[PDB]
Design a protein around this ligand. Sequence first.
Ligand SMILES: NC(=O)c1cccc(N)c1
Ligand SMILES: NC(=O)c1cccc(N)c1
Ligand code: NA
Ligand code: NA
Lengths: 191, 192
Amino acid sequence: NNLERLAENTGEFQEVVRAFYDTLDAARSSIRVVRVERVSHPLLQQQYELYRERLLQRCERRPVEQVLYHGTTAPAVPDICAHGFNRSFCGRNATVYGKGVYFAKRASLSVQDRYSPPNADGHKAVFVARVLTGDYGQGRRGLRAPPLRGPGHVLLRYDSAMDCICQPSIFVIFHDTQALPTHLITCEHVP
Amino acid sequence: WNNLERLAENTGEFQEVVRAFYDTLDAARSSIRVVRVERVSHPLLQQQYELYRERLLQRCERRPVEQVLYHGTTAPAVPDICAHGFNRSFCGRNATVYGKGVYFAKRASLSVQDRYSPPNADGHKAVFVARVLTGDYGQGRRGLRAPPLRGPGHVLLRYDSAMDCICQPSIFVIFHDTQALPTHLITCEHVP
Ligand SMILES: NC(=O)c1cccc(N)c1
Ligand SMILES: NC(=O)c1cccc(N)c1
Ligand code: NA
Ligand code: NA
C-alpha cells in the first residue's frame, strides 16, 4: 500500500498534528486525531516537483507553494492515494469559486462534516497537501478553469483560484499534478 | 512564451503529419483541406508525460503503451489545450458514452466530424494530434470517472484507459491530464 501509519512518537507526527490543531479554531475542542498516515506516490511526487520547479522559475512572487487541507469521504481516500486529487474523485458540490478541487488554509473548514463526513466508526478523513497555488486569481462561480488574467499579462489564466484577495482561505486547483497529498489525518468528533 | 509554431509545407515534419492525417481520413479524404499545421510545445507537460511513459514501459509487458491519436475540438478550447494539455476542465467537454474523460480517435475520420471539430466563423476546424499513453485498456462505460475495474485475475485495480471495444479499438478515453501530449495542431476545412 501507499499509506504508512506514523508513530505518535515522531517529529513528523507531531508537526502534522500541531499545524492541524493550530488551525482548528472553533472546532479544536471537539475533534480528536485517531491516526496520521504518510502518503507515498513516487510518480505523482516527481511530476509535482517538475511543476514546482517550473513555477519557481516562472513566478516572481513567493510563496508558490502552500500546505493546505482537503476533507473528503471514506470511499475517495484510496483513489486520492492512488491517483492524487482530481474532480472525478473529490467532492463536486462546491462551484462558487470554480469547478475544481477545493483546498483550505485552515483545518477548521475541512473538518466540517459536509466535507469530511464520518464513516461507520465516526472516522473523518482530512488530507494534508503541498499545493502549487502559484499566482491565484479571484474565483468565479461555475468556471471550468482558473480565471482569466486579462490584458496586463502574457499568460491566459491564473494558476489557481481563491475565495478573496483579502486573507485568502480557500484555493481551487484544476490540474491533477498541482497538489501532492503528503499525509492523511483520520480524526473524529469528541464532546 | 509562445506555445504554437507554424510549420512550412515543404518540410519533412509537415508532410509526415499530413500523410498520417489523410491516411486515416477515409471517406473524408476528398473533402478535407489542410489550412495550416502547427507544432505544439509544452516543456513541462512533455517532461511529466515522459515520466509517466517511463513508468508505464517498466510496468507493462504488452506493447504499444503509447499511440498517436486525434482529438477534434472547438476554436475557443485551442489556446487552453496548448497552454494546459487535455482536460475535461481546459478541453471542451468530451462525450460521455465510455466514461467521463478525454476522448481520442485512432482515425482522423472520426475527429474531423463537425460534431467534434466544429468550424469557426472562417470555416476552419481544429484537430490536435497527440501522443497518448493508452497502456492497458478496458471497455469503457457511461458514468465511469476512471478507467474500468480489471476484476478478478489481476493485481491492479483499474485499467490505464478505456476504449470503445476490446476488438479493434477506435476510441480511447483517458482520465489523467499527463497521459496525453499534444504534439501538433491541424487546422483544416471542408471543401465544396
Ligand atoms: N474539501 C475541503 O476540505 C474543502 C476545502 C475548502 C472549501 C471547500 N468547499 C471544501
Ligand atoms: N474530440 C474528439 O476528437 C473525439 C474523438 C472520439 C470520440 C469523441 N467523442 C470525441
Ligand atoms: Na492574458
Ligand atoms: Na483487480
